[PDB]
Amino acid sequence: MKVEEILEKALELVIPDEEEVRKGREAEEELRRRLDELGVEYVFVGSYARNTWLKGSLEIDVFLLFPEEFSKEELRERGLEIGKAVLDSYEIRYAEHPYVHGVVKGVEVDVVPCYKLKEPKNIKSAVDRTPFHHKWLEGRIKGKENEVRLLKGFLKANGIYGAEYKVRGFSGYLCELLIVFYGSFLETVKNARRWTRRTVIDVAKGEVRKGEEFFVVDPVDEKRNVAANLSLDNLARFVHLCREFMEAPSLGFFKPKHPLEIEPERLRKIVEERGTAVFAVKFRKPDIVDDNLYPQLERASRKIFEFLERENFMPLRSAFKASEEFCYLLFECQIKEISRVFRRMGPQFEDERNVKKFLSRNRAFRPFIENGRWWAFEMRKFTTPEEGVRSYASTHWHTLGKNVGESIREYFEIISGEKLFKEPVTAELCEMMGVKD
RNA sequence: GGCCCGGGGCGGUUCGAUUCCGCCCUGGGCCACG
Protein backbone atom coordinates (compact mmCIF):
# COMPACT_ATOMS: atom_id res chain seq x y z
CA MET A 1 0.00 0.00 0.00
CA LYS A 2 3.10 2.24 0.04
CA VAL A 3 5.15 3.74 -2.81
CA GLU A 4 7.77 0.99 -3.17
CA GLU A 5 5.02 -1.61 -2.89
CA ILE A 6 2.80 0.05 -5.49
CA LEU A 7 5.63 0.54 -7.96
CA GLU A 8 6.49 -3.16 -7.77
CA LYS A 9 2.97 -4.21 -8.68
CA ALA A 10 3.05 -1.60 -11.47
CA LEU A 11 6.11 -3.02 -13.22
CA GLU A 12 3.66 -5.72 -14.31
CA LEU A 13 1.45 -3.23 -16.17
CA VAL A 14 4.29 -1.49 -17.97
CA ILE A 15 6.85 -4.21 -18.63
CA PRO A 16 6.33 -6.40 -21.73
CA ASP A 17 6.16 -10.09 -20.78
CA GLU A 18 8.59 -12.67 -22.20
CA GLU A 19 6.21 -13.57 -25.04
CA GLU A 20 6.05 -9.96 -26.28
CA VAL A 21 9.82 -9.66 -25.86
CA ARG A 22 10.56 -12.92 -27.71
CA LYS A 23 8.17 -11.98 -30.51
CA GLY A 24 10.25 -8.83 -30.81
CA ARG A 25 13.67 -10.50 -30.79
CA GLU A 26 12.61 -13.04 -33.41
CA ALA A 27 11.22 -10.19 -35.51
CA GLU A 28 14.42 -8.17 -35.03
CA GLU A 29 16.79 -11.03 -35.80
CA GLU A 30 14.73 -11.96 -38.87
CA LEU A 31 14.76 -8.34 -40.02
CA ARG A 32 18.53 -8.03 -39.75
CA ARG A 33 18.87 -11.04 -42.02
CA ARG A 34 16.62 -9.58 -44.72
CA LEU A 35 18.40 -6.22 -44.58
CA ASP A 36 21.81 -7.88 -44.49
CA GLU A 37 21.06 -10.07 -47.49
CA LEU A 38 20.64 -6.76 -49.33
CA GLY A 39 23.70 -5.39 -47.56
CA VAL A 40 22.08 -2.05 -46.71
CA GLU A 41 23.56 0.32 -44.12
CA TYR A 42 21.03 0.61 -41.28
CA VAL A 43 20.74 1.31 -37.57
CA PHE A 44 18.05 0.23 -35.08
CA VAL A 45 16.89 3.11 -32.90
CA GLY A 46 13.89 4.19 -30.83
CA SER A 47 12.58 2.55 -27.67
CA TYR A 48 12.90 -0.90 -29.17
CA ALA A 49 16.67 -0.63 -29.55
CA ARG A 50 16.85 0.55 -25.94
CA ASN A 51 14.26 -1.84 -24.48
CA THR A 52 12.24 1.08 -23.13
CA TRP A 53 9.03 0.51 -25.09
CA LEU A 54 5.87 0.38 -23.00
CA LYS A 55 4.11 -2.97 -22.65
CA GLY A 56 1.74 -3.38 -25.59
CA SER A 57 3.57 -0.86 -27.79
CA LEU A 58 6.14 -3.09 -29.49
CA GLU A 59 7.30 -1.26 -32.62
CA ILE A 60 10.69 -1.64 -34.28
CA ASP A 61 12.38 1.43 -35.75
CA VAL A 62 14.93 0.76 -38.49
CA PHE A 63 16.72 3.79 -39.86
CA LEU A 64 18.44 3.48 -43.25
CA LEU A 65 21.67 5.50 -43.44
CA PHE A 66 22.27 7.48 -46.62
CA PRO A 67 25.25 9.63 -47.64
CA GLU A 68 25.06 13.37 -47.00
CA GLU A 69 25.21 14.11 -50.75
CA PHE A 70 22.12 12.15 -51.80
CA SER A 71 19.02 14.04 -52.88
CA LYS A 72 15.86 13.86 -50.77
CA GLU A 73 14.32 12.07 -53.77
CA GLU A 74 16.90 9.26 -53.67
CA LEU A 75 16.24 8.57 -49.97
CA ARG A 76 12.50 8.20 -50.55
CA GLU A 77 12.91 6.14 -53.73
CA ARG A 78 15.72 3.93 -52.41
CA GLY A 79 13.97 3.93 -49.05
CA LEU A 80 10.76 2.58 -50.55
CA GLU A 81 12.69 -0.01 -52.57
CA ILE A 82 14.38 -1.36 -49.45
CA GLY A 83 11.23 -1.13 -47.34
CA LYS A 84 9.08 -3.00 -49.86
CA ALA A 85 11.60 -5.82 -50.25
CA VAL A 86 12.18 -6.31 -46.53
CA LEU A 87 8.61 -6.25 -45.15
CA ASP A 88 5.88 -8.91 -45.12
CA SER A 89 3.20 -6.23 -45.68
CA TYR A 90 4.20 -2.68 -46.55
CA GLU A 91 2.44 0.67 -46.72
CA ILE A 92 3.77 4.14 -47.49
CA ARG A 93 3.33 6.67 -44.69
CA TYR A 94 4.14 10.39 -44.33
CA ALA A 95 5.62 12.89 -41.87
CA GLU A 96 8.20 15.51 -42.90
CA HIS A 97 9.17 13.13 -45.69
CA PRO A 98 7.63 9.83 -46.84
CA TYR A 99 8.74 6.55 -45.21
CA VAL A 100 7.53 2.93 -45.00
CA HIS A 101 5.56 1.11 -42.30
CA GLY A 102 4.89 -2.63 -42.13
CA VAL A 103 5.03 -6.01 -40.42
CA VAL A 104 7.67 -8.73 -39.90
CA LYS A 105 6.93 -11.97 -38.02
CA GLY A 106 3.90 -10.35 -36.44
CA VAL A 107 5.38 -7.08 -35.19
CA GLU A 108 5.05 -3.44 -36.29
CA VAL A 109 8.05 -1.90 -38.06
CA ASP A 110 8.98 1.58 -39.30
CA VAL A 111 11.60 1.97 -42.06
CA VAL A 112 12.82 5.54 -42.26
CA PRO A 113 15.43 7.01 -44.61
CA CYS A 114 17.84 9.49 -42.99
CA TYR A 115 21.26 11.04 -43.59
CA LYS A 116 24.40 9.57 -42.05
CA LEU A 117 26.11 12.58 -40.47
CA LYS A 118 28.36 13.50 -37.58
CA GLU A 119 27.75 16.45 -35.25
CA PRO A 120 24.05 17.40 -34.74
CA LYS A 121 24.52 20.37 -37.08
CA ASN A 122 24.48 19.70 -40.85
CA ILE A 123 21.13 18.11 -40.07
CA LYS A 124 18.81 18.31 -43.08
CA SER A 125 15.64 16.77 -41.71
CA ALA A 126 14.20 16.30 -38.22
CA VAL A 127 14.69 12.54 -38.68
CA ASP A 128 18.47 12.97 -38.98
CA ARG A 129 18.60 13.73 -35.27
CA THR A 130 16.91 10.48 -34.27
CA PRO A 131 20.21 8.58 -34.63
CA PHE A 132 22.05 11.09 -32.42
CA HIS A 133 19.36 10.97 -29.76
CA HIS A 134 19.95 7.23 -29.76
CA LYS A 135 23.72 7.44 -29.32
CA TRP A 136 23.37 9.92 -26.47
CA LEU A 137 20.81 7.69 -24.78
CA GLU A 138 22.00 4.13 -25.25
CA GLY A 139 24.94 4.56 -22.92
CA ARG A 140 23.13 6.61 -20.29
CA ILE A 141 19.76 4.84 -20.06
CA LYS A 142 21.20 1.33 -19.71
CA GLY A 143 19.93 -0.27 -16.51
CA LYS A 144 16.95 2.08 -16.04
CA GLU A 145 14.49 0.90 -18.69
CA ASN A 146 11.89 -0.06 -16.11
CA GLU A 147 11.93 3.49 -14.76
CA VAL A 148 11.26 4.74 -18.28
CA ARG A 149 8.33 2.28 -18.56
CA LEU A 150 6.78 3.18 -15.20
CA LEU A 151 6.81 6.82 -16.34
CA LYS A 152 5.35 6.06 -19.76
CA GLY A 153 2.72 3.91 -18.08
CA PHE A 154 1.88 6.65 -15.62
CA LEU A 155 1.49 9.23 -18.39
CA LYS A 156 -0.51 7.04 -20.75
CA ALA A 157 -2.94 5.87 -18.07
CA ASN A 158 -3.70 9.53 -17.42
CA GLY A 159 -4.10 10.37 -21.10
CA ILE A 160 -1.03 12.57 -21.44
CA TYR A 161 1.58 10.23 -22.88
CA GLY A 162 1.98 10.86 -26.62
CA ALA A 163 3.47 14.10 -28.04
CA GLU A 164 1.40 14.22 -31.22
CA TYR A 165 -1.24 16.97 -31.59
CA LYS A 166 -4.16 14.82 -30.49
CA VAL A 167 -2.51 14.54 -27.03
CA ARG A 168 0.03 17.35 -26.57
CA GLY A 169 1.78 15.34 -23.89
CA PHE A 170 5.15 13.73 -23.13
CA SER A 171 7.09 12.17 -26.01
CA GLY A 172 8.94 8.91 -25.38
CA TYR A 173 12.28 10.68 -25.73
CA LEU A 174 11.19 13.21 -23.14
CA CYS A 175 10.53 10.42 -20.63
CA GLU A 176 14.00 8.95 -21.12
CA LEU A 177 15.71 12.31 -20.85
CA LEU A 178 13.80 12.76 -17.59
CA ILE A 179 14.94 9.41 -16.23
CA VAL A 180 18.55 10.20 -17.10
CA PHE A 181 18.13 13.44 -15.10
CA TYR A 182 16.33 12.28 -11.96
CA GLY A 183 17.52 8.67 -11.97
CA SER A 184 14.16 6.97 -11.50
CA PHE A 185 10.39 7.37 -11.84
CA LEU A 186 9.99 8.26 -8.17
CA GLU A 187 12.57 11.06 -8.24
CA THR A 188 10.98 12.35 -11.42
CA VAL A 189 7.56 12.40 -9.80
CA LYS A 190 8.95 13.92 -6.58
CA ASN A 191 10.66 16.84 -8.31
CA ALA A 192 7.94 17.39 -10.90
CA ARG A 193 5.83 18.37 -7.89
CA ARG A 194 7.83 21.64 -7.88
CA TRP A 195 7.70 22.32 -11.64
CA THR A 196 6.36 25.66 -12.91
CA ARG A 197 5.58 27.09 -16.34
CA ARG A 198 9.01 28.76 -16.26
CA THR A 199 10.98 25.61 -15.54
CA VAL A 200 13.89 24.71 -17.77
CA ILE A 201 15.59 21.31 -17.57
CA ASP A 202 18.99 21.12 -19.28
CA VAL A 203 20.15 17.49 -19.14
CA ALA A 204 23.51 18.23 -20.72
CA LYS A 205 24.39 20.75 -18.03
CA GLY A 206 22.81 18.74 -15.22
CA GLU A 207 20.87 21.84 -14.20
CA VAL A 208 17.36 23.23 -13.63
CA ARG A 209 16.77 26.93 -14.15
CA LYS A 210 14.04 29.49 -14.76
CA GLY A 211 13.19 30.49 -18.32
CA GLU A 212 10.24 32.10 -20.06
CA GLU A 213 8.49 28.82 -20.80
CA PHE A 214 8.74 25.16 -19.79
CA PHE A 215 11.86 24.08 -21.66
CA VAL A 216 13.69 20.74 -21.63
CA VAL A 217 16.92 21.19 -23.61
CA ASP A 218 17.85 18.49 -26.07
CA PRO A 219 21.31 17.11 -25.16
CA VAL A 220 21.99 16.92 -28.89
CA ASP A 221 20.83 20.45 -29.77
CA GLU A 222 20.63 23.21 -27.15
CA LYS A 223 18.21 25.20 -29.32
CA ARG A 224 15.61 22.44 -29.43
CA ASN A 225 12.92 22.03 -26.73
CA VAL A 226 12.15 18.34 -26.16
CA ALA A 227 8.79 19.24 -24.57
CA ALA A 228 7.87 21.77 -27.24
CA ASN A 229 4.43 20.29 -27.83
CA LEU A 230 3.56 19.71 -24.17
CA SER A 231 0.61 22.03 -23.55
CA LEU A 232 0.38 24.27 -20.51
CA ASP A 233 -2.66 22.45 -19.14
CA ASN A 234 -1.12 19.00 -19.60
CA LEU A 235 2.05 20.19 -17.85
CA ALA A 236 -0.21 21.34 -15.05
CA ARG A 237 -2.11 18.05 -14.85
CA PHE A 238 1.13 16.10 -14.50
CA VAL A 239 2.39 18.32 -11.69
CA HIS A 240 -0.95 17.78 -9.95
CA LEU A 241 -1.01 14.04 -10.55
CA CYS A 242 2.48 13.87 -9.04
CA ARG A 243 1.33 15.68 -5.91
CA GLU A 244 -1.67 13.39 -5.53
CA PHE A 245 0.45 10.33 -6.19
CA MET A 246 3.00 11.06 -3.46
CA GLU A 247 0.12 11.84 -1.13
CA ALA A 248 -1.86 8.67 -1.86
CA PRO A 249 0.22 6.11 -3.82
CA SER A 250 -2.21 3.94 -5.77
CA LEU A 251 -1.85 1.22 -8.39
CA GLY A 252 -4.75 3.07 -9.97
CA PHE A 253 -2.53 5.80 -11.37
CA PHE A 254 -1.20 3.15 -13.77
CA LYS A 255 -4.58 1.84 -14.95
CA PRO A 256 -6.48 3.46 -17.83
CA LYS A 257 -9.59 5.17 -16.52
CA HIS A 258 -12.78 3.27 -17.42
CA PRO A 259 -14.92 5.02 -20.10
CA LEU A 260 -17.93 4.86 -17.74
CA GLU A 261 -20.78 5.73 -20.12
CA ILE A 262 -23.86 7.55 -18.84
CA GLU A 263 -27.55 7.17 -19.60
CA PRO A 264 -28.42 10.13 -21.85
CA GLU A 265 -31.31 10.58 -19.41
CA ARG A 266 -29.04 11.44 -16.49
CA LEU A 267 -27.20 13.87 -18.78
CA ARG A 268 -30.50 15.54 -19.71
CA LYS A 269 -31.33 16.18 -16.05
CA ILE A 270 -27.87 17.49 -15.29
CA VAL A 271 -28.08 20.03 -18.13
CA GLU A 272 -31.50 20.89 -16.78
CA GLU A 273 -30.03 21.32 -13.28
CA ARG A 274 -27.29 23.58 -14.63
CA GLY A 275 -29.82 25.57 -16.66
CA THR A 276 -27.33 26.34 -19.40
CA ALA A 277 -27.43 26.20 -23.18
CA VAL A 278 -25.58 23.17 -24.42
CA PHE A 279 -25.14 22.61 -28.12
CA ALA A 280 -22.91 21.31 -30.87
CA VAL A 281 -21.83 22.31 -34.35
CA LYS A 282 -21.81 19.09 -36.39
CA PHE A 283 -20.06 18.72 -39.73
CA ARG A 284 -18.26 16.13 -41.87
CA LYS A 285 -14.76 15.08 -40.88
CA PRO A 286 -12.27 16.19 -43.50
CA ASP A 287 -10.16 13.25 -44.70
CA ILE A 288 -6.88 14.29 -43.10
CA VAL A 289 -4.39 13.01 -40.54
CA ASP A 290 -4.98 13.76 -36.86
CA ASP A 291 -2.00 16.08 -36.82
CA ASN A 292 -3.77 18.38 -39.24
CA LEU A 293 -7.30 17.81 -37.99
CA TYR A 294 -6.99 18.48 -34.26
CA PRO A 295 -5.10 21.75 -34.41
CA GLN A 296 -8.00 22.79 -36.65
CA LEU A 297 -10.73 21.57 -34.32
CA GLU A 298 -8.93 23.60 -31.65
CA ARG A 299 -8.90 26.73 -33.77
CA ALA A 300 -12.51 26.46 -34.89
CA SER A 301 -13.58 25.72 -31.33
CA ARG A 302 -11.71 28.77 -30.04
CA LYS A 303 -12.96 31.17 -32.73
CA ILE A 304 -16.57 30.26 -32.00
CA PHE A 305 -15.91 30.35 -28.24
CA GLU A 306 -14.48 33.86 -28.63
CA PHE A 307 -17.45 34.95 -30.71
CA LEU A 308 -19.69 33.70 -27.95
CA GLU A 309 -17.87 35.64 -25.26
CA ARG A 310 -17.85 39.00 -27.07
CA GLU A 311 -21.41 38.38 -28.14
CA ASN A 312 -22.16 38.12 -24.38
CA PHE A 313 -23.56 34.61 -24.26
CA MET A 314 -21.16 33.88 -21.39
CA PRO A 315 -19.58 30.63 -22.63
CA LEU A 316 -18.33 28.34 -19.87
CA ARG A 317 -16.26 25.81 -21.78
CA SER A 318 -15.75 24.32 -25.21
CA ALA A 319 -14.81 20.83 -26.37
CA PHE A 320 -14.74 18.68 -29.49
CA LYS A 321 -14.83 15.08 -30.69
CA ALA A 322 -14.07 13.49 -34.04
CA SER A 323 -15.53 10.23 -35.33
CA GLU A 324 -14.70 8.34 -38.52
CA GLU A 325 -17.88 10.02 -39.72
CA PHE A 326 -18.32 13.56 -38.35
CA CYS A 327 -16.75 16.14 -36.06
CA TYR A 328 -18.47 17.91 -33.19
CA LEU A 329 -17.68 21.27 -31.59
CA LEU A 330 -19.36 21.52 -28.20
CA PHE A 331 -20.22 24.61 -26.19
CA GLU A 332 -22.06 25.44 -23.02
CA CYS A 333 -23.28 28.97 -22.32
CA GLN A 334 -24.73 30.65 -19.26
CA ILE A 335 -27.14 32.60 -21.44
CA LYS A 336 -29.86 30.66 -23.26
CA GLU A 337 -31.38 33.92 -24.48
CA ILE A 338 -30.43 37.57 -24.32
CA SER A 339 -32.61 40.61 -24.99
CA ARG A 340 -32.79 42.16 -28.42
CA VAL A 341 -31.77 45.63 -27.15
CA PHE A 342 -28.29 46.44 -25.81
CA ARG A 343 -26.41 49.71 -25.33
CA ARG A 344 -23.82 51.22 -27.67
CA MET A 345 -21.41 53.66 -26.05
CA GLY A 346 -21.27 56.98 -27.82
CA PRO A 347 -19.07 60.14 -27.69
CA GLN A 348 -18.78 62.41 -24.66
CA PHE A 349 -21.33 65.28 -24.61
CA GLU A 350 -18.79 68.01 -25.39
CA ASP A 351 -17.75 66.55 -28.74
CA GLU A 352 -20.39 68.39 -30.78
CA ARG A 353 -18.98 66.89 -33.98
CA ASN A 354 -19.12 63.18 -33.20
CA VAL A 355 -22.22 63.67 -31.08
CA LYS A 356 -23.97 64.90 -34.20
CA LYS A 357 -22.77 61.98 -36.31
CA PHE A 358 -23.81 59.62 -33.51
CA LEU A 359 -27.37 60.99 -33.46
CA SER A 360 -27.65 61.08 -37.25
CA ARG A 361 -28.13 57.31 -37.42
CA ASN A 362 -31.86 56.72 -37.18
CA ARG A 363 -32.52 54.07 -34.56
CA ALA A 364 -35.72 52.70 -33.08
CA PHE A 365 -35.23 54.11 -29.61
CA ARG A 366 -33.69 57.57 -29.34
CA PRO A 367 -30.32 57.81 -27.53
CA PHE A 368 -29.76 59.24 -24.06
CA ILE A 369 -27.11 60.98 -21.95
CA GLU A 370 -25.56 59.16 -19.00
CA ASN A 371 -22.55 60.06 -16.86
CA GLY A 372 -21.29 62.57 -19.38
CA ARG A 373 -21.52 60.69 -22.65
CA TRP A 374 -24.14 59.59 -25.13
CA TRP A 375 -25.52 56.08 -25.45
CA ALA A 376 -27.89 54.42 -27.89
CA PHE A 377 -30.17 51.39 -27.69
CA GLU A 378 -29.54 49.10 -30.64
CA MET A 379 -31.04 45.75 -31.66
CA ARG A 380 -29.36 42.36 -32.07
CA LYS A 381 -29.57 40.09 -35.11
CA PHE A 382 -29.92 37.08 -32.81
CA THR A 383 -30.89 36.40 -29.23
CA THR A 384 -29.68 32.85 -28.59
CA PRO A 385 -26.19 31.27 -28.78
CA GLU A 386 -27.32 28.77 -31.41
CA GLU A 387 -28.64 31.55 -33.63
CA GLY A 388 -25.34 33.34 -33.16
CA VAL A 389 -23.17 30.39 -34.07
CA ARG A 390 -25.42 29.65 -37.05
CA SER A 391 -24.80 33.17 -38.22
CA TYR A 392 -21.09 33.10 -37.36
CA ALA A 393 -20.26 29.68 -38.84
CA SER A 394 -22.20 30.38 -42.06
CA THR A 395 -20.21 33.55 -42.72
CA HIS A 396 -16.85 32.94 -41.03
CA TRP A 397 -16.32 29.32 -42.09
CA HIS A 398 -13.03 30.35 -43.72
CA THR A 399 -11.55 31.33 -40.38
CA LEU A 400 -12.11 27.93 -38.78
CA GLY A 401 -9.16 26.06 -40.26
CA LYS A 402 -8.22 25.39 -43.89
CA ASN A 403 -9.98 22.01 -43.96
CA VAL A 404 -12.40 22.11 -41.03
CA GLY A 405 -13.64 25.42 -42.37
CA GLU A 406 -14.01 24.20 -45.94
CA SER A 407 -16.13 21.37 -44.58
CA ILE A 408 -18.34 23.67 -42.48
CA ARG A 409 -18.84 25.87 -45.55
CA GLU A 410 -20.38 22.93 -47.46
CA TYR A 411 -22.29 21.53 -44.48
CA PHE A 412 -22.92 21.98 -40.76
CA GLU A 413 -25.84 22.02 -38.35
CA ILE A 414 -26.36 23.01 -34.74
CA ILE A 415 -27.74 20.30 -32.46
CA SER A 416 -29.11 20.62 -28.94
CA GLY A 417 -31.81 19.32 -26.65
CA GLU A 418 -32.47 15.58 -26.59
CA LYS A 419 -31.31 15.29 -30.21
CA LEU A 420 -27.83 16.04 -28.84
CA PHE A 421 -27.68 13.38 -26.11
CA LYS A 422 -28.15 10.79 -28.86
CA GLU A 423 -25.01 11.95 -30.66
CA PRO A 424 -21.63 10.36 -29.76
CA VAL A 425 -20.51 13.21 -27.50
CA THR A 426 -21.85 12.50 -24.03
CA ALA A 427 -18.45 11.42 -22.76
CA GLU A 428 -16.87 14.67 -23.96
CA LEU A 429 -19.82 16.62 -22.47
CA CYS A 430 -19.47 14.97 -19.04
CA GLU A 431 -15.76 15.84 -18.92
CA MET A 432 -16.59 19.35 -20.16
CA MET A 433 -19.15 19.91 -17.38
CA GLY A 434 -17.29 18.22 -14.54
CA VAL A 435 -20.01 15.60 -14.13
CA LYS A 436 -18.65 13.33 -11.40
CA ASP A 437 -19.24 9.88 -9.86
C1' G B 1 -1.85 21.99 -41.43
C1' G B 2 -1.60 24.64 -36.59
C1' C B 3 1.21 28.51 -33.54
C1' C B 4 4.60 32.93 -32.93
C1' C B 5 6.93 37.45 -35.17
C1' G B 6 6.90 41.11 -39.61
C1' G B 7 5.71 43.67 -44.05
C1' G B 8 1.98 45.43 -48.59
C1' G B 9 -2.61 45.93 -49.94
C1' C B 10 -8.51 45.82 -48.98
C1' G B 11 -13.85 44.69 -47.05
C1' G B 12 -17.20 45.24 -43.30
C1' U B 13 -18.71 47.23 -38.54
C1' U B 14 -18.10 52.02 -35.62
C1' C B 15 -19.38 58.93 -33.63
C1' G B 16 -14.46 57.52 -34.01
C1' A B 17 -10.15 51.87 -36.32
C1' U B 18 -3.39 51.07 -36.63
C1' U B 19 -6.20 49.53 -32.45
C1' C B 20 -12.82 45.32 -33.11
C1' C B 21 -14.66 41.31 -37.17
C1' G B 22 -12.55 39.37 -41.40
C1' C B 23 -10.25 38.72 -46.85
C1' C B 24 -6.17 38.97 -50.50
C1' C B 25 -0.72 38.96 -51.51
C1' U B 26 3.94 38.44 -48.87
C1' G B 27 9.43 37.46 -45.41
C1' G B 28 11.26 34.77 -41.52
C1' G B 29 10.82 31.64 -37.25
C1' C B 30 8.61 27.09 -34.70
C1' C B 31 5.64 22.45 -33.74
C1' A B 32 3.44 17.14 -34.85
C1' C B 33 10.00 12.49 -29.97
C1' G B 34 11.79 11.35 -35.45
Side-chain angles (χ1 to χ4, degrees):
Chain A
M1 291 289 100
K2 186 187 71 298
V3 191
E4 307 174 299
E5 326 281 57
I6 302 292
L7 294 186
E8 268 290 345
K9 302 170 191 176
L11 298 174
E12 203 160 303
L13 306 177
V14 298
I15 296 180
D17 53 18
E18 281 186 288
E19 9 294 343
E20 177 167 48
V21 169
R22 170 176 49 53
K23 181 178 183 178
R25 286 296 170 298
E26 284 172 9
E28 154 180 26
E29 178 64 355
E30 164 55 1
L31 193 53
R32 281 205 153 77
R33 292 165 176 164
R34 301 186 187 181
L35 282 163
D36 289 340
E37 182 45 44
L38 306 195
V40 174
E41 214 182 316
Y42 65 79
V43 70
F44 281 60
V45 305
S47 57
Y48 174 76
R50 296 172 236 122
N51 301 303
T52 55
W53 81 82
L54 181 62
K55 171 173 183 290
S57 285
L58 177 56
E59 194 185 64
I60 293 173
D61 300 299
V62 174
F63 275 49
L64 310 177
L65 277 11
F66 288 110
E68 201 173 317
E69 294 85 20
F70 281 43
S71 66
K72 80 159 189 287
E73 300 75 19
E74 262 293 291
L75 281 58
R76 62 93 38 200
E77 281 170 352
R78 279 266 50 210
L80 178 44
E81 231 70 287
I82 292 168
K84 189 191 303 299
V86 102
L87 303 168
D88 286 350
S89 315
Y90 73 98
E91 159 194 295
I92 297 181
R93 224 80 102 67
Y94 308 74
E96 175 162 40
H97 296 290
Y99 65 85
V100 182
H101 186 79
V103 175
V104 169
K105 297 192 75 173
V107 334
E108 300 303 310
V109 178
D110 274 337
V111 177
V112 188
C114 74
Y115 289 112
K116 179 180 182 177
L117 318 159
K118 193 167 189 178
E119 292 297 59
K121 337 286 185 174
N122 312 307
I123 203 168
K124 304 191 174 194
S125 204
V127 297
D128 295 324
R129 232 178 298 127
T130 310
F132 290 99
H133 288 166
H134 181 63
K135 283 300 171 60
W136 193 93
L137 241 39
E138 41 155 50
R140 295 169 244 230
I141 197 72
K142 198 66 186 295
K144 298 188 178 57
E145 26 285 312
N146 288 345
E147 295 306 317
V148 170
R149 281 153 178 164
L150 279 169
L151 179 56
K152 292 186 175 183
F154 190 73
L155 295 164
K156 185 143 174 274
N158 292 280
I160 53 178
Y161 176 37
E164 62 279 22
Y165 275 116
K166 173 173 185 176
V167 191
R168 280 168 177 289
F170 297 55
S171 66
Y173 182 47
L174 176 51
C175 290
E176 278 180 58
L177 289 185
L178 285 181
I179 296 299
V180 173
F181 197 84
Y182 295 114
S184 74
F185 166 85
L186 195 52
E187 282 299 293
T188 303
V189 163
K190 291 193 190 180
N191 288 276
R193 288 191 292 185
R194 321 286 262 302
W195 285 355
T196 70
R197 66 196 84 204
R198 296 279 181 285
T199 298
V200 184
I201 298 178
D202 187 325
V203 210
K205 293 183 177 176
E207 169 187 56
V208 182
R209 47 174 187 274
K210 209 262 196 188
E212 283 159 62
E213 52 192 354
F214 185 79
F215 199 120
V216 183
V217 334
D218 190 346
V220 181
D221 191 330
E222 312 312 88
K223 282 298 164 285
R224 195 97 190 316
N225 178 349
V226 176
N229 217 35
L230 167 72
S231 70
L232 177 51
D233 293 337
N234 279 166
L235 158 59
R237 297 182 175 104
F238 180 70
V239 177
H240 195 259
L241 274 183
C242 285
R243 295 176 172 166
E244 294 187 312
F245 182 79
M246 292 290 84
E247 200 187 358
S250 171
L251 187 64
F253 289 77
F254 301 74
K255 297 178 188 179
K257 325 301 180 175
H258 272 171
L260 182 55
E261 287 89 77
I262 185 179
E263 59 270 17
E265 180 54 48
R266 186 186 161 203
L267 187 56
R268 190 194 69 64
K269 292 203 195 67
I270 285 186
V271 182
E272 181 167 279
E273 287 177 42
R274 298 181 130 230
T276 52
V278 182
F279 67 90
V281 168
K282 177 179 173 190
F283 60 98
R284 285 173 199 296
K285 178 180 172 173
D287 190 40
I288 54 178
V289 309
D290 293 343
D291 279 347
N292 288 316
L293 180 72
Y294 287 76
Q296 282 184 55
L297 291 185
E298 287 182 334
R299 188 191 202 301
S301 227
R302 203 188 68 237
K303 299 304 291 180
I304 290 171
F305 184 88
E306 274 161 31
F307 160 78
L308 291 168
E309 57 195 13
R310 63 168 179 284
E311 216 41 77
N312 290 99
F313 284 114
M314 294 175 80
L316 284 169
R317 298 187 73 187
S318 94
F320 61 72
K321 183 223 182 68
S323 300
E324 292 276 39
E325 57 197 25
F326 314 87
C327 282
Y328 306 78
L329 302 184
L330 312 90
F331 312 89
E332 174 182 42
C333 297
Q334 284 182 256
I335 311 298
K336 294 182 175 179
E337 174 161 61
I338 193 164
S339 62
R340 189 135 247 140
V341 294
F342 64 97
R343 26 185 284 159
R344 176 151 285 159
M345 186 182 83
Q348 307 212 308
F349 89 80
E350 6 214 358
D351 191 355
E352 188 184 10
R353 182 125 306 191
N354 290 296
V355 165
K356 192 180 170 184
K357 290 180 56 188
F358 181 68
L359 305 188
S360 66
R361 309 269 266 117
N362 56 306
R363 304 165 216 281
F365 289 110
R366 181 184 291 283
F368 56 101
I369 292 169
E370 177 188 298
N371 282 302
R373 48 202 309 139
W374 287 84
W375 304 80
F377 287 120
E378 230 77 299
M379 304 294 260
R380 294 188 170 80
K381 277 279 186 303
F382 36 77
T383 60
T384 72
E386 297 97 334
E387 260 161 51
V389 177
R390 185 207 292 133
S391 181
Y392 186 68
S394 286
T395 68
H396 293 60
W397 57 273
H398 187 279
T399 201
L400 321 170
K402 158 63 69 70
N403 308 297
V404 160
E406 275 164 3
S407 179
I408 289 177
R409 177 204 44 190
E410 49 182 48
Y411 161 71
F412 87 78
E413 66 173 298
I414 297 159
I415 316 291
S416 61
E418 318 290 349
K419 180 182 177 175
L420 179 52
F421 302 138
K422 281 136 87 71
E423 294 298 325
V425 296
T426 71
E428 283 60 25
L429 289 172
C430 279
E431 156 73 50
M432 187 181 83
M433 300 187 299
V435 177
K436 57 184 177 185
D437 171 56

